[model samples]
Target: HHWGYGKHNGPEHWHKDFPIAKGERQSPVDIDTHTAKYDPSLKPLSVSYDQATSLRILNNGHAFNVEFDDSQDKAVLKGGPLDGTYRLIQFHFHWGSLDGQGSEHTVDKKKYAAELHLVHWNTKYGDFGKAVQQPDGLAVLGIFLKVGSAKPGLQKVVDVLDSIKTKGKSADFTNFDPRGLLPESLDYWTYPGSLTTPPLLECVTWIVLKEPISVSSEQVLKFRKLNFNGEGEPEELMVDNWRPAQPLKNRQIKASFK
Candidate 1:
């Protein structure tokens, strides 16, 4: 069913149907930072991650929230065009309805079926929360989800989907390496903007990777089965778990490269 006022409209409708949805602090939007200016002082952070990490999946009755430990705290960006350090914070995802489209970031005004946002903070400011206050504080790593080419990395997550199939249930998933999910090229575009969700905080630094990670149709369907309702029994299955885009607020986005 239509979640908003009209096809591809506003957040007003979804905010009403799912009240807690209104309380969410993050959302996604179309990225257009071509004309924005770049700050030379603005640098990227590196994420030092474990060879294999762990994941915690929560059945929120709307979808399964996949979370992991951010103990690594930081990473180094080297052997690339730019040399510097980047910090690792927390990461999360956005979806549409089960078996429907739910990604937030868009390319050429075209939205993917789902989106994964690996949120990071620039540690130069001292702490993660503090970095959010600086113009170059937040650096979000974006990945697009589409139903196509097979990806062994994505297959790993699908293997455990059955482990957390019930609502209000949570399971500790083992043998997960986040790096396995990263696309080949780390090349990305940078910019300044606010969090996708409200209070729409204006202090955010964005880094959108130009390279995309691919997944097979089987993997996409497994993600589709992920609903708000947990494993056991009957409940309203959460679908179309994506938020409508917010206002650009006159902020400009900067691209790291062409």
Candidate 2:
């Protein structure tokens, strides 16, 4: 609730307030493909999402989020590094002030224009609030974004940016299939890591896809226009809302495909 991506309050300063910021298993690590081991045991990812469950979208000062109805197992992720069914809760993006350097996680030290995070909570943990406190509570799908052809399905999300332009603003965003935003390849890298944001809980099982999705330069520019400050507060553009890559520590990244 008390953080910003300023020179004075960004990632380097987060550890001061949240001790877990410097925890062993942190997110957005530099994925070195040459070092990653291919796991033939890892199962293919199973994603079953119901478009109707996509409820609304909101701007939380830090990032814009598309929330889902997780009350039931109508939309879920199973198999592939998962112990039980995980319910889709919400999805959001981390971007930069400009193109070519907005992504949180880098592959072989290469940065993308942006990164998309699909958050899901374990069903065995009862609820998201509880799951977040546990070691194996969350499963996040990380999809890197690059600037190229305009993504058609993603344009629907961009079209609503005008409605929730300011911090704390929200609007009805229904019947949206979060799956439509995925790349054709389900091949991914799996590792145990934390949330890229504050609290930086080490509960996430990171599933970073190899292939990136495309977005136009124009579409990427729209994200920068969102204001981090509220209507009454001094206007601050929401850009560079990404944490730099953390150390991999003793963790080993597993590849689902050879």
Candidate 3:
């Protein structure tokens, strides 16, 4: 089966590919903050990398989906070194239009071309299932994806797509810095929420960025080149690899200054 949206491969059809989508907290967020009061003491630690993260490249035969491990830097959060912290659970993207349109999070009803979410959790707390329920259990970094000259920040990732371009196949890499995939600016918007994936776990501390990083048409194509044909099989190309937006449900979205 082809990965691109030809018959049953569009966002509308993702539920078939991943039954997990049946749970809530999946994409399409409407972010319009009216109540602005936020916690001042909740600090994000300067991420220090101990060991290089692991990279698992997938050729779902459609779009590219990379999984990372031990990928977080150190930090003093809420007045403690949240050491031996959460690993890089997953990294994914959202996008649309060459002129820049159709991001997943809508601000005042406006959408950008794309958004990237790097999901993580505090292993110190316990299983992702358990930590996401606490006040200081999870963290997520959001980066805006804009159209322009392909960014150097993203090239580290784009360069690897060529290795896995078929269905149900994967490649392994070691000693890689997944943090290099983040944008230059650390300024962001923070909030308490759950996994945009299934079961809608309200375990994440969302850190959506203020500035956007630019990318070229070709870089966008690399994401579109991932495989979706499951593991341990022939490679299947992955196309349109995004989850639908989720509900705000009275959650407060906060921002971070430089």
Best by TM-score: 2
Give all candidates' CA lDDT scores: 0.59, 0.93, 0.58
Model 3, runs deviating above 4 Å? 1-28, 33-45, 59-63, 71-85, 96-102, 129-137, 227-237
**Tens-digit lDDT track for model 1 on 42-125?**
444344565435567676654566665445543433322233345554455666554346676666576777777766555567
Order the candidates by TM-score, highest first — what do you get? Answer: 2, 1, 3
Question: TM-score per candidate, in order?
Answer: 0.71, 0.98, 0.70
After superposition, the stretches of candidate 1 with alpha carbons farther than 4 Å from their true spots are 1-10, 13-27, 33-47, 50-52, 71-90, 97-100, 121-138, 197-203, 230-234
As for candidate 2, its clashing pairs are none
Worst 10-residue lDDT window, candidate 2: 46-55
Candidate 1 lands at a TM-score of 0.71
Model with the higher TM-score, candidate 1 or 3: 1
Task: Look at candidate 3 and tell me the lDDT of residue 121.
Answer: 74
Q: Please provide, for model 3 over 1-258, each residue's C-alpha lDDT reduced to its tens digit, 9 standing for 90 to 100.
A: 432443565545655666645544434466664544445654554554445465686654434456765434432122112344555565666554343453666666666666787766777865666677775577766777767778766776678766765555667855556566666766556666555543445556666766777788788866655555555667544543444466655556665442
Alpha carbon lDDT at 68, candidate 3: 62
